[PDB]
């Protein structure tokens, strides 16, 4: 189905996110914002609906995904909560941008037909 395979290249491409050659900015998005330990005591008022790699990862897994675009959904809100939350000049921003650009290169790729 044109469905399975959109799938399997959302797999792929979170992979590909979570694979070594991209740790140096994908490593703060592996796992969910771990807001106790950084003291980010506003976090949870500014950020409705958080998301990471891991929760995307253990989605796909459970098939809660339809299509590529609802995975594509939750890839986008991880990179919007970075923007939303934290300072433009946020070292964490620099690397969200970098991830996302692998991200984009390769959805962009996502087969057609
Ligand atoms: C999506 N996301 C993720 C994180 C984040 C998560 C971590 N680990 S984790 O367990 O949570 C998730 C996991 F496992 F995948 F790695 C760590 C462990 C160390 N750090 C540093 C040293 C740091 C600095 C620069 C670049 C990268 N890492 C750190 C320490 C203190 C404060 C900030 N940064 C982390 C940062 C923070 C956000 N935002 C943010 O830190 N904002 C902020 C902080 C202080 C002042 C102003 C700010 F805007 C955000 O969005």
Redesign the pocket.
Known sequence: SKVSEQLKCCSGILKEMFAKKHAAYA????????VE??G?HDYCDIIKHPM?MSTIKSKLEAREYRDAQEFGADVRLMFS??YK???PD???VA??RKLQDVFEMRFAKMPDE
């Open positions: 490593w703060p998005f592996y796992k969910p914002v771990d330990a950084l980010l990471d909560n970075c939350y934290n300072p946020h070292e964490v690397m969200a």
